[model samples]
Target: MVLSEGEWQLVLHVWAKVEADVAGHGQDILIRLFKSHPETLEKFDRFKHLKTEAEMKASEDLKKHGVTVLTALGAILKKKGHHEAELKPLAQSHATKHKIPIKYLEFISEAIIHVLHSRHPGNFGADAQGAMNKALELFRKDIAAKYKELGYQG
Candidate 1:
């Protein structure tokens, strides 16, 4: 989506907070995802065995993985018009290696929206949500396309 300068500034504003605490934000996002979609845990062998929130939270590997996701997201957000190029390989890896369906990515978008809304209430207003939704939709589309190309049924 082509965001106006104002919209871009808004996104950047909210994202600055998100980017400030990458590890914390990433952990919050992943925790939200896991709670929202329990099935998502099954896709990760390392996390599948983690039965409780404490277990998941204490898992160093889980935290690392969350950082990995956030790092990738930071990169994607940083490169403004090149989302597809930036996300394609990650999508391909997710589709082929982890067998994650595209819908799970949607869940993640929602989780992130939840995070931004809760953490930065002032900046995450209706317009900011719309901007974020549009930006994430591009990510979803690119990843979904790669997932389809990799022959995933979902």
Candidate 2:
């Protein structure tokens, strides 16, 4: 999917924000994401509990992968017009793995961009919806390693 100049910027912004946050706290980031966007819990699995050592280790693993994918995506987004809305298809693609509806992930994506832009206060042009498409494309391709099962399906 082709993305306008404005759309690409948003994608870059979202990727940057996620990368930074995950680098600092992927586990906490997941917790915060869940808290901020409870709708995602309907689609993605969560292991936020810190009661057991195994759970903590699992969270650490998630954080590691989160940082890796977010870093890859951020690098890609910074180079071009990275739109947030463009990320929808990426979410949908991932959602398909778990058999969730595309709309559900779209809902989660919108909420994520909303929170990120609001916090960063940068110029995230072209609203969330418009960027989601490219966001999806960029996201799916950039972080393709994370969802190895997809195996070049998209």
Candidate 3:
């Protein structure tokens, strides 16, 4: 669940480029997740009303929420992939409070990859995709571990 120093640099470089439109890209990834798993909507209390891309796109609330999520994502990334402790509280909170399923983890990784490839085809070439994919896997793994540690069966 660790990245070599160069991999971290590559991931951070890609991230830095997208920070210019962080919110919009955040919305892209969120909407992609929602689309990939419609059941995901019911998990987000304030966002359940959004049923379609058009609907979600027009949502200021959803847009702001996207930024909110991305802000946290940036914080996690800034840690240079050392997020084991960071994910502990988040995993517990998601289980106790948000009903966030462990299965949906990879969907958001797909979302990020989809948007990254679409938005910056050149920057997110095969190498970048592999690096980011591995990076998000660490996040997924830690959260899953914490969920198990916190006694959420399956």
Candidate 4:
């Protein structure tokens, strides 16, 4: 199902406010995801050598993944379909070739929570977390479904 119009507004609002500077903070979000679950880094050959903030900070690979997440969210937010067909190729790339687990989506979900929660009241809507949670989870849900559909069980 698609997000309620109100729900979409709530998410778009926070994303709009953060669009300027925090987009650059995308890498920080990735670091937060990797920091909380170090094993996730091993799935990416480019990110495998990265073990700590110091090493990861210098990684274009990690930064590119972070940027892709932001880009992906934008793509998913544009519509309300199941996304299985549209998102399948990337899921195949990640689930089969890269062998990325579905749990990584939830990890980044929390990582988004980490960055958003740190911004305080003035920068974002007071109830932004609720909508952001739903939006990210929606994105997470589609991919998880695709992962299973592909029989890449993990």
Candidate 1 global TM-score: 0.91
Ranking the candidates on TM-score from highest down gives 3, 1, 4, 2
Model 1 root-mean-square deviation = 1.6
Off by over 4 Å in 4: 80-85, 123-126
**What's the residue-level lDDT of 43 in candidate 2?**
52
Per-residue accuracy of model 2 over 16-35 as CA lDDT, tens digit each: 55555665544544445556
Give TM-scores for every candidate, taking all chains together and pairing residue i with residue i. Answer: 0.91, 0.47, 0.93, 0.83
Task: Give candidate 1's error at residue 37 in angstroms.
Answer: 0.8
Model 1 Cα lDDT, one tens digit per residue, 1-154: 5767776677778998888888888888998999889988888877888888888788888888888998888788777657778777887678777777778888999999999999999989999998888878877877777778778836
Name the runs in model 1 displaced over 4 angstroms: none
In candidate 3, where is summed lDDT lowest over 10 consecutive residues? 81-90
Q: How accurate is candidate 2 locally (lDDT)?
A: 0.52
Q: What is the C-alpha RMSD of each candidate to the true structure, in Å?
A: 1.6, 7.4, 1.3, 2.4
Residue 100 of candidate 2: its Cα lDDT?
A: 44
Please name the candidate that would achieve the greatest TM-score relative to the true structure. Answer: 3
Model 1 lDDT-worst window of ten: 1-10
Candidate 3 all-Cα RMSD = 1.3
